[PDB]
Design a protein around this ligand. Structure first.
Ligand SMILES: O=C(O)c1ccc(Nc2nccc(Nc3ccccc3OC(F)(F)F)n2)cc1
Length: 266
């Protein structure tokens, strides 16, 4: 930032969670007593998979973003064996844990999260950063219960054509990404529809038991709605889950959607 941290500057605390790169810890900076989170990546592990350059992207991108619905990255440092990310600490944990708790969210809490997400993504898109990995496990909650986009591990500059070896769940990836094609900001609009659906239903709309058939359901956009999903909600999700990226709405239209405005507290 201006100056260079070391492990000895921080008292480390409770393990927050993760993960196979290394874990995330609550920590406190000794001199200021500032409370934050410290993500410990293992180097040996980053190099037994040559991901060292992706971290530099994540770090570079996330550190330059200022938005109340995006998790701050303050800086980083390393020693012999590992790298440390100094992160804003989000006190209420992941959206996933919350979703697991409530099983599903009401329309008011979904619309509010979608709004918060939409604002954060709009900001991202103004810098032509595209996220590409929006999902409950990557979204944290602030002290006021506000959604924060947390993990920028897969974010990248737009437009992009990468055939990134897609290794985790397909559940949030749009057709143009699973088929390995070129893609832009509209990726995050598809993911926003997947998320909106998952928030209301409790499961992502293309969920399946194998990767191979999730792939099929996505590329053919086969989802159905349980009876309890309201018309307004169905309408927004159908607008978002469009095979053709150019037919997906702009974030502005998401924000101005009657189902959003009627239910959003934000
Ligand atoms: O369950 C809890 O007690 C809990 C309480 C507070 C926080 N808060 C928190 N603040 C900053 C970073 C961070 N990483 C993280 C932690 C666990 C899983 C995934 C993570 O990374 C992410 F968010 F990027 F995915 N977690 C997280 C969890």
């Amino acid at each position: 930032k201006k100056r260079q941290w070391a492990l000895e500057d921080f008292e480390i605390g409770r393990p927050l969670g993760k993960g196979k790169f290394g874990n995330v810890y609550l920590a406190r900076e000794k001199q200021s007593k500032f409370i934050l989170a410290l993500k410990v990546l293992f180097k040996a592990q980053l190099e037994k998979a040559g991901v060292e350059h992706q971290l530099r992207r994540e770090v570079e991108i996330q550190s330059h973003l200022r938005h109340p619905n995006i998790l701050r990255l303050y800086g980083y440092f390393h020693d012999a064996t590992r790298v440390y990310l100094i992160l804003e600490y989000a006190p209420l944990g992941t959206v996933y844990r919350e979703l697991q708790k409530l099983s599903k969210f009401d329309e008011q809490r979904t619309a509010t999260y979608i709004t918060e997400l939409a604002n954060a993504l709009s900001y991202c898109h103004s810098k032509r950063v595209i996220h590409r990995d929006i999902k409950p496990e990557n979204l944290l909650l602030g002290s006021a219960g506000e959604l924060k986009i947390a993990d920028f591990g897969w974010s990248v500059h737009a437009p992009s054509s990468r055939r990134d070896t897609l290794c985790g769940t397909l559940d949030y990836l749009p057709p143009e990404m699973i088929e390995g094609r070129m893609h832009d900001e509209k990726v995050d609009l598809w993911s926003l529809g997947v998320l909106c659906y998952e928030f209301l239903v409790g499961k992502p709309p293309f969920e399946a038991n194998t990767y191979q058939e999730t792939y099929k359901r996505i590329s053919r956009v086969e989802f159905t709605f349980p009876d309890f999903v309201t018309e307004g909600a169905r309408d927004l999700i159908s607008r978002l889950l469009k095979h053709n990226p150019s037919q997906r709405p702009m974030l502005r239209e998401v924000l101005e959607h009657p189902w959003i405005t009627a239910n959003s507290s934000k």
